[PDB]
Design a protein around this ligand. Structure first.
Ligand SMILES: CCCCCCCCCCCCCCCC(=O)OC[C@H](COP(=O)(O)O)OC(=O)CCCCCCCCCCCCCCC
Ligand SMILES: CCCCCCCCCCCCCCCC(=O)OC[C@H](COP(=O)(O)O)OC(=O)CCCCCCCCCCCCCCC
Ligand SMILES: CCCCCCCCCCCCCCCC(=O)OC[C@H](COP(=O)(O)O)OC(=O)CCCCCCCCCCCCCCC
Ligand SMILES: CC(C)CCC[C@@H](C)[C@H]1CC[C@H]2[C@@H]3CC=C4C[C@@H](OC(=O)CCC(=O)O)CC[C@]4(C)[C@H]3CC[C@]12C
Ligand SMILES: CC(C)CCC[C@@H](C)[C@H]1CC[C@H]2[C@@H]3CC=C4C[C@@H](OC(=O)CCC(=O)O)CC[C@]4(C)[C@H]3CC[C@]12C
Ligand code: NA
Ligand code: NA
Lengths: 668, 151, 50, 663, 127
């Protein structure tokens, strides 16, 4: 028509105008008119007590929303249907919920999984949670042997258990509850792609709660009581095990790890940086001097001097540097390859030292925690190529005796030299992993290492573009141009005669055509077919546009967004890996670096219950202090939020209005 | 503008030490693989800079020049041949040179672009107040007497 | 110089105490102040009328 | 020592504890204890009335800060030294300043340039400004024939004049006041390096005020009364003249300009885009048909057809496209050259049309507004190369008669062909300036054009790096090499024989070595000097690192920050240039594109009628605007603490009055 | 808390602060950071300082070079040094009249206060 008719499609019963006067009496703060209207309401005919608006509000709630406790005492003095009014008393953090605890299909606003203590934990109010635990309320355990209720109810249970007040109260130790809950919520967010950000939010909440308990640690003996609690530094090991990147790199914790890392050094971190370079240089030069000791006399000044973990790092990395200067020296110095040089004879204790060090590293931690870090996998590939290299040198020495250059092209000396060179690339890229100790080159290296996983998602797409244009240029050019009468037959050849002939040759031609290293005369046919040459050069041109312009600048943009997202969490991430580095040098069994790891390098009971009860009650005493001052601290921080909702004005408004209705009731 | 670039230089110089260790890495590899495989001293010109590029991976210093100039498009593929017939060492050497070009030109250099995107975003907030500090360091070196009558 | 700094510290302290007022954010404890400024007045007037 | 002592270094007098009881009688709202203590204060024994805290807090101010008007009436009933208390009544927007207006070296908190109406304009409260204009208060004019007071006082005067309530009140028309003040504050921010962001902030305030008056225009006849007010569309021409990029691209004004741009197309902007391409294609094909008319009969359907400005754009740009397809056709077709082909005989009316069009464009607007836009300068260079081309063709035809290739190397046919080709590059890059009409290719082109000025600041640094490494590589390679036997002698040759020989050759070698186009055998010496070859290749290497690894990625980062700063304002600043494109086709005298370009008391009655009509419309807009901003002052989603300081005394004074009536 | 009135109420009774330098470990660095956090407030420097520009400059220098010493608590001492560097600019902002500004920027205990400001890297005092 010309107009639209607006009618209430979903009908509401509404209420008798006398009932509207009763709900006008309440919420205005009338202690007189509500009492008069309820005494009238005893007579059944005039009005009903449990009257409900078309918009919620069944009488009792209005006395909670407009926070007035005398009307709650008046309505609970009568028989008002409570229903879910206790839960509405929990949301607003009204501590008049005592009056709903101590005393006394209908459109419940809440999902029916909600018990009072679940919604008490969601509001994170310490007082109401203490008021509900004192009566005794349980939570269901989450594990299982129609579908929205199950995942919603499990997320409400984990959302309730992850609150820092059912972990401050009702936990034997809140650090294990925060750590194990952060683990179960993280690994639970990986299970369900749906509800991913909510379980990640809860795991971030548990990871922040533990740092906010560390922040309350004064008097550093308490910090050692926390970080030594074995049910060494067992708590830190268990914190690094659960990836608690904010528990570690608390500034209190790094004081403990930094002093532990600097045993006898005095004000080492106060000296000049060039003096630090001189001390690290001359300690790095004397690494066989300190490590011949601890084999002669481990109870000695030099034997106790390498037991200090900052000196273990300079001895371990200094030994590794001399291994690398010796590999620099290897290339500056017969098919029957024997001891080719004195260099290799010097190399074998270092290589057996790294193989022993990686097997010894795999004897503790397991292949899961070993295979989690990428540098250990790089050590596996490196040392595997060292075993292949020395095995092909031995096998090359036996059963071979002498053409100069002519050889089998799979002669094991050549494969030994090639795998040796690849193992030198992988061996001398380990110095990058030495950057996490430095404070300037540290966070940079870990930000790049964090962008690598976003690059490797991108190169898949590029590999499918390579398979695409490789199929296309091979298919078009394996008939038209083929040369078998040529001398050098590859892209490498100075002439570049065949590029797209075969598929592997085409993959090399496109991969090298990322760079400016393959010329156009590549795409010419020895015959005279200008159509297939033009189609092939257009094929190669759109490859260069999609790869060089379309995708590589998308990779730049992707690393711009990823590096923006990384550098926020760079400092707290760097220090977690710096502790991982530091805390691998605290333990004994791990001193005496690689050439001295196995041999000197060749010239070529009621007291258990007493300590458990001692340490247990001591730790629970410290926890009692930390949970006390923590709950006081967060309650303090609840007050300061710099924002006032509209229901605070709703509280002041009735504070004035009920006082008006009472003074005017006493004056008239 | 000049002071924002001067501000980004200290973040570049932290970056080039990583690249120097990558140069040390692939230089150790390509020297170690190509010092025996090929040599040939019967050349009129004998380096990368020559018109034919005869020996590039032969010496460590020659390999450092070959990788550094292979950042740019200035070193051709026929560099990685062997005068003898060893297709395996030529392929492993060209794969090592290829992963050098991927790590240096595709991953390392665009990470440097991203790093200068974040650093230049962090600098240009405090650009106006830090330009004028250096402008008064320039101005206030001309207020005193004893420094007039130029060079 | 101490007279000039007397003037600057005077008008500076006045300026920052002026800027403490205009923060565009009220914490909840301000409502905790107004609520007791009504509540004590309630329990005093009701103490004088009863 | 072991401690550090803390003493009050800047000591002041401490008020007598009775005076502390008097200043504790105020700040609580006592209407009884203040009155008793002041009646006691008439006796000079116990308390002086004008008592001052060590922290401001004069007795009167506390009654203003804690906003209580009855204590202001009580203190002004007595003789309290007011001083600067009126100004403190202005800051808090207390409308009890009436009581300080109608009635009645000391540490003034304010700079002594501050009159009441300047600080009334800084607070932007309409009511207090109306209360001070009704008494009659003037502002000093800013112009001049010890130094902080002068620039601070001028910035307070311009800060007061730029407020949208001394422009809503006290201005004959607030659009000229907003436009001219935005101009004077922008061009005043360019004068003073210091205080740049503050005058730019005030000019942005004036530029927002005008758009916020156009937002109050309902009933589109009012919008035409505003946008036609000549003291055509004179107010939009004057708005584009003052770079009011937010006045233009209000959504109300772009409907007037869009409907003006579409005269007799009923709902053109609703059709399918391919149908739009067909209509623009066949109107673009019939350009000579519509433009032979308006020469035959300008009072005719086809003569009035080309007077519509959307059809002028398709005829002008379609004619320009056929000029460019004809330049494509020129290269697909004797020292003493003629007008050699039929092509250039066809070209000459096109070229004389553009020269006439640019001289005709320079007859109106002046060389300042003409030289402000860059495409007009590009037209100047293009048509200058056209004059040089045809002049060297005519000069080449006379006094020359025939070696086919062996020529002078400066022979005017070659210079004519080279300048003709450069003029074709410049001529066929004008199609990019056709992008502002399109809604998808529009804001992109203007964002790139706004990054160009940030690129050109960067290339001067790069030119100094070129002079640096060019001085080095020339200085090192001038001696060691100079192959003067080679058949081909430069970088462009097949062998690249001498590249760092001379300075110009070195500049070409480094510039082309930005790209991968110069090999390494360039840096050899014909002699055997490995040290100078290595130092030269290290200099060339550090040139490649500074230019390609540091300098060019810094340019990428710079364009990342600049493009982030541009794309916030990209859409509004696109539409300003789109109305600069649109509004150049509204006027007559400018039709008939390039090849067809050449070949009395009633005045006072209309001035009073338009003047009183426009003042009535502005009466309505200022009324509903002031109502709109006073509505928006209420909703700010933030309460300062002094609101709680108002409610707390509104309870406290009521307490000390009820307790005064019951006891 | 940076409240001027309560600080004036406590200085009038006479209260001292320990000096930070010395010849179990959380109390020492936490107590040191509370002492420097208290001395860096712009009301102990408005009161209880002979001249607050030298106190702001020298405290910004000791808090910056103290943040370089301790890698832990780095952002907190940098925050306090930024607070001291903002305080000096917020005292310049209160300079009305050219003559006063020259009294400040000529105070040798030339332009000695500008030279001493550039010496302490006060990039917001300058500009
Ligand atoms: C598809 C999944 C991957 C992501 C999607 C990619 C988006 C689609 C890519 C578009 C296809 C590439 C264009 C066609 C290639 C081509 O023409 O290459 C084919 C040939 C190139 O020369 P040949 O003909 O000799 O091969 O084109 C020509 O004949 C010459 C004229 C064409 C000019 C090309 C204009 C396109 C602009 C591309 C360069 C942009 C540079 C950016 C810097 C300003
Ligand atoms: C390690 C510390 C530094 C940072 C970490 C770097 C991350 C790991 C880098 C991955 C290794 C590089 C890939 C291997 C190189 C290689 O294959 O090079 C080795 C050869 C290249 O040709 P040759 O065999 O002739 O040498 O590979 C081939 O045989 C041809 C088929 C392989 C195709 C490569 C596909 C990988 C994609 C890389 C290009 C991406 C371009 C991006 C634009 C879209
Ligand atoms: C100065 C104002 C401009 C801005 C300031 C620029 C910052 C300073 C620039 C540093 C100087 C450049 C380095 C020296 C050039 C050079 O060595 O070039 C000189 C030569 C290059 O080969 P030649 O010796 O044959 O010339 O160096 C060598 O001999 C080979 C070994 C050096 C390896 C260079 C390692 C530096 C890393 C630079 C590449 C980074 C690539 C980034 C992608 C990962
Ligand atoms: C080929 C060999 C002979 C040398 C190749 C490596 C060296 C040239 C450089 C490259 C990386 C540098 C390393 C990078 C990082 C560190 C960590 C850094 O250790 C610290 O920061 C000390 C701990 C602290 O700072 O508290 C100083 C030494 C070291 C190993 C550097 C030692 C010198 C290295 C190995
Ligand atoms: C793709 C390469 C080969 C360039 C093609 C040459 C021309 C045919 C193209 C280049 C730019 C195009 C122009 C770019 C922008 C416009 C504006 C546009 O005009 C409008 O938007 C109509 C007004 C409106 O949309 O309200 C449509 C035509 C036109 C001139 C285009 C016409 C066709 C042009 C001249
Ligand atoms: Na390992
Ligand atoms: Na023009």
């Amino acid at each position: 028509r010309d107009r639209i008719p607006l009618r209430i499609v979903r009908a509401e019963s509404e209420l008798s105008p006398s009932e509207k006067a009763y709900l006008n009496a309440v919420e205005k703060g009338d202690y007189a008119s509500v009492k008069k209207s309820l005494e009238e309401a005893e007579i059944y005919f005039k009005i009903n007590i449990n009257c409900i608006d078309p918009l919620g509000r069944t009488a009792l709630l209005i006395a909670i929303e407009n926070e007035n406790l005398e009307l709650i005492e008046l309505l609970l003095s009568f028989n008002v249907y409570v229903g879910d009014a206790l839960l509405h008393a929990i949301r607003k953090e009204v501590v008049g919920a005592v009056e709903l605890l101590l005393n006394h299909k209908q459109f419940s606003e809440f999902t029916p999984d909600i018990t009072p203590i679940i919604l008490a934990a969601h509001t994170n109010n310490y007082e109401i949670i203490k008021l509900l635990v004192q009566k005794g309320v349980s939570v269901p355990r989450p594990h299982e042997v129609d579908s929205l209720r199950h995942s919603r109810s499990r997320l409400n249970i984990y959302k309730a258990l992850a609150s820092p007040s059912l972990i401050a109260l009702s936990s034997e130790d809140p650090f294990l509850t925060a750590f194990q809950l952060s683990w179960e919520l993280q690994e639970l967010s990986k299970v369900e792609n749906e509800f991913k950000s909510e379980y990640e939010e809860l795991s971030r909440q548990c990871k922040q709660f533990a740092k906010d308990l560390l922040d309350q640690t004064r008097s550093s003996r308490e910090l050692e009581i926390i970080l030594n609690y074995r049910d060494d530094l067992a708590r830190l090991k268990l914190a690094i095990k659960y990836r608690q990147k904010e528990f570690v790199a608390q500034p209190n914790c790094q004081q403990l790890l930094a002093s532990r890392w600097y045993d006898e050094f005095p004000g080492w971190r106060r000296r000049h940086w060039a003096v630090k370079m001189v001390t690290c240089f001359i300690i790095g030069l004397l690494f066989p001097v300190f490590s011949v000791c601890y084999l002669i006399a481990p109870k000695s000044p030099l034997g106790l001097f390498i037991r200090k973990p900052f000196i273990k790092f300079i001895c371990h990395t200094a030994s590794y540097l001399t291994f690398l200067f010796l590999l620099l020296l290897a290339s500056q110095h017969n098919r029957q390859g024997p001891p080719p040089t004195i260099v290799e004879w010097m190399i074998l204790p270092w290589v057996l030292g790294f193989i022993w060090g990686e097997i010894k590293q795999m004897w503790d931690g397991g292949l899961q925690d070993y295979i989690h870090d990428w540098w250990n996998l790089m050590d596996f590939v490196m040392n595997s190529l060292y075993l292949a290299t020395i095995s092909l040198k031995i096998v090359a020495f036996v059963k071979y005796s002498n053409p100069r250059e002519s050889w089998d092209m799979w002669h094991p000396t050549l494969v030994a030299e090639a795998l040796f060179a690849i193992a030198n690339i992988f061996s001398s890229l380990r110095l990058i992993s030495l950057f996490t100790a430095n404070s300037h080159l540290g966070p940079l290296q870990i930000s790049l290492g964090r962008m690598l996983l976003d690059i490797l998602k991108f190169l898949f797409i590029y590999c499918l573009v390579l398979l695409a244009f490789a199929n296309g240029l091979n298919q078009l050019y394996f008939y038209y141009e083929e040369t078998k009468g040529l001398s050098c037959k590859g892209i490498r050849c100075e002439k570049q005669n065949n590029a797209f002939s075969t598929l592997f040759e085409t993959l090399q031609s496109l991969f090298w055509s990322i760079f400016g290293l393959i010329n156009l005369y590549v795409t010419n046919v020895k015959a005279q077919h200008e159509f297939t040459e033009f189609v092939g050069a257009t094929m190669f041109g759109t490859y260069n546009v999609i790869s060089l312009v379309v995708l590589l600048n998308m990779l730049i943009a992707m690393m711009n967004n990823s590096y923006q997202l990384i550098a926020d969490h760079a400092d707290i991430e760097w220090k977690f890996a710096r502790t991982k580095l530091w805390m691998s040098y605290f333990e004994e069994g791990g001193t005496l670096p690689t050439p001295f790891n196995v041999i000197p390098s060749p010239k070529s009971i009621g007291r258990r219950a007493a300590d458990n009860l001692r340490r247990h009650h001591q730790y629970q005493e410290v926890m009692r202090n930390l949970v006390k001052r923590y709950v006081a601290a967060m309650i303090r921080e609840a007050k300061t939020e710099e924002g006032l909702t509209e229901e605070n004005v709703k509280e002041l408004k009735q504070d004035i209005s009920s006082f008006r209705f009472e003074v005017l009731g006493l004056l008239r």
